[PDB]
Design a protein around this nucleic acid. Sequence first.
RNA 1: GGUUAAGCGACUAAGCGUACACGGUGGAUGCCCUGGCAGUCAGAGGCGAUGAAGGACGUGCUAAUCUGCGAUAAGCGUCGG
RNA 2: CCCGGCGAGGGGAGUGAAAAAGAACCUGAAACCGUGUACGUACAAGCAGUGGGAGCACGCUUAGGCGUGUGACUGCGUACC
RNA 3: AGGACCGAACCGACUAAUGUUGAAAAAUUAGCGGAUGACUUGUGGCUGGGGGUGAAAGGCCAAUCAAACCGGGAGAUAGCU
RNA 4: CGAAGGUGUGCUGUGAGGCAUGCUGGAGGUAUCAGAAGUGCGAAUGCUGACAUAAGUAACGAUAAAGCGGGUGAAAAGCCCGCUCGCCGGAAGACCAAGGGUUCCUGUCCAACGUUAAUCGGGGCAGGGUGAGUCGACCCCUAAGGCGAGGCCGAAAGGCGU
Lengths: 46, 110, 56, 117, 120
Amino acid sequence: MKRTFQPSVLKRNRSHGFRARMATKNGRQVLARRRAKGRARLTVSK
Amino acid sequence: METIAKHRHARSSAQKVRLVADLIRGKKVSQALDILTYTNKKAAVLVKKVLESAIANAEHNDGADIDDLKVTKIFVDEGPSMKRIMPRAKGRADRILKRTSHITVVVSDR
Amino acid sequence: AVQQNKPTRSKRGMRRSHDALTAVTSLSVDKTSGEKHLRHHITADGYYRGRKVIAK
Amino acid sequence: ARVKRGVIARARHKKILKQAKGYYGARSRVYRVAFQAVIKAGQYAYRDRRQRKRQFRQLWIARINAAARQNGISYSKFINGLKKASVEIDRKILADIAVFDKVAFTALVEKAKAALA
Amino acid sequence: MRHRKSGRQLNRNSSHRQAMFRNMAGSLVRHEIIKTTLPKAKELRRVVEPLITLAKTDSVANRRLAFARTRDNEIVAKLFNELGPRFASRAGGYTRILKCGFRAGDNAPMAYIELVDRSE
RNA sequence: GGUUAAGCGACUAAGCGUACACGGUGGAUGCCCUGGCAGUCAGAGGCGAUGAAGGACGUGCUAAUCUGCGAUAAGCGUCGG
RNA sequence: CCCGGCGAGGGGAGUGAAAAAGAACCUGAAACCGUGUACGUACAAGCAGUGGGAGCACGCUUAGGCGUGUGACUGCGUACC
RNA sequence: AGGACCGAACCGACUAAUGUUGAAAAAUUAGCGGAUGACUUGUGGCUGGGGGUGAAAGGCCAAUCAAACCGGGAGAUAGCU
RNA sequence: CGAAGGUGUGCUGUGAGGCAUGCUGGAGGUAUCAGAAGUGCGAAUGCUGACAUAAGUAACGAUAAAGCGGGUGAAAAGCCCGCUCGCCGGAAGACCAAGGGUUCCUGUCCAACGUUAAUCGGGGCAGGGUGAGUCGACCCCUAAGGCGAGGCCGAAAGGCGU
Ligand SMILES: [Mg+2]
């Protein structure tokens, strides 16, 4: 049974990565919110 | 003089060990050791080690009379439990309990 | 099929009345070394009917 | 100011379990069951404080009737003659007399029979 | 429902039972002393003892028939030469069972089985 | 004193129930706070291309983490206590 | 030091006011699980109590039928929101 | 030559049994259909919620869909329990 | 010379309650009169933690299959060696991509894990191990597509595009 999550690092970085987030105004809002919340892993990269 | 020797956090259920404890309660030590070492249970091995520990406990720390030594008080108390997760069908989880036991043996000549 | 009421410890205790173990009493005494062993069984060091059976 | 209820609640629980000391199983250990047992014990105690008077009254009449019929008279006739003799002895003492001192009870029945006529 | 029936199952099918006894029969005669469970030892006598009786007479036909069991030439080689003369003057009862308690892994009735004399 | 008959009859607890004593698991209650919450009085009310906020990796006699620091890497120079 | 598998665990000795403060460590309740003692229970039917109540065991008292623990039998009694 | 035939890999899921706190939040076994095409599959990309996509079942859109998920309005409102 | 708290006993009040004391406890508590409430729990398929019941019952995860001898070891059906028996063998063999991120080898241990035993292990601890001009990546170029100086358009955000 093929489950929903099929891992792929290349797609993972291009979708939720740091540069993908910074490419849009909305992504900067997401990064600002996580920085305010103080999360250790700001993005998904590495 | 009463001699106390106990095993704490023994990896066995209190109910299982208690089934062997009542076999030797109040019996003579000379025969009590024979019953334990000829009993086909894991708990028999555990209580035998405690009983032998009490025997040398009542001679290195007490005076004499090994032959007249008699087990007076024996009881098994439930100890801390360990919580483990056993997955079941349809994504349901069941918390299984791994029960530890405290085996206390009190032996005295009188 | 499952309980409708919680059984008490009295019912639990009476159910375990027949679960008590039967301790052996008079296993045997060897005729050569005089050591305890099961009936119709060899001893720890391979004694049965006095004569060697295992030779280690 | 925040108030901690850990001390007063425990004291109330001990009091209820104290009153229900030794009924059966959970009724002497579990407050949720002990409290119901304590209240039901109160209703029975209140109810039987009135039933005790009726119970002992029933016993005394039975013993008086037994003793009177031993002398050859029914209980109803004994009291009927007893009232006609203007004697105001209650059934408790009459039952007490009938058991311990036989000759005294024989005096009561003879007077009742005499006063009956 | 086991009325006058003999032949234990040992929680195995016919193929596994035949192979396990065949392997165990060769191992027993090779060493003259093995330790196995009581039910295994008791059914092993219904295999090795008939084999020894067949080995009492040495012939080309008997050796080939004896080779069809235990499927090993060395076991057949030891028979008809070693265990033949020893048991020539014996009528049955070539093996005996010595109970030795229970295992510590599964608590099973343990017993040694060996030949009569073993020449030791 | 004995035989027979009749009547009555406790002492048994495999286990359980009640009370007490002694224990185990459990971590409630009491006490405590280099932790929070709300304010008052003052300051600051911004940082950054002379490279910000926030991070990665290194840096000790160091194996890890926290803190500091940045190949001059738990640090360097000057002036004071 | 001893038992124990050169373990775990435990008992001694010692420190300590205290180890009934031993690192699972202040105080350590209840549910729950046991050991011993006292009483009852193997011909008795049901919200398990209540009123009466023999018997049994322990403390009384120096007698005075007292108190505590249990409860054979018996009338009544079908939980709470 | 064939949207040809029988039949492996591969794709799919018509029947029966088991399983139904399962080995499995739709599977296993025995059978079954297609299997050179309107076929299947790997990698990457695009279409974003009154919207997408749909050989059309109001089916699918991260184990969900007659309007996905997360946060906010928000302690919505409830003559109801 | 013993506070709070905990655990029993006795006395006392029409009741919520109050007082005294035995033991534990080992440092705070607080009269009377007033003042302020996060002020009194048995229920809300209440919330959090702990512990029961079923019960030592079901189950221990493909019916491919184990037996013996020796060894280490306190202990061997499961670890190592050897002999057999069986299974896969267009796989249950071998090499890679994706993914994982030290699971690889050696020494040592059985606290926790392995649905049992454990000396064994993909478990704990320590040490070691990955060597490229020719392999791949990197690098030159490009498809679908993404971004996009100027530019066009759009309340702003922004959309499209050379
Ligand atoms: Mg109690």
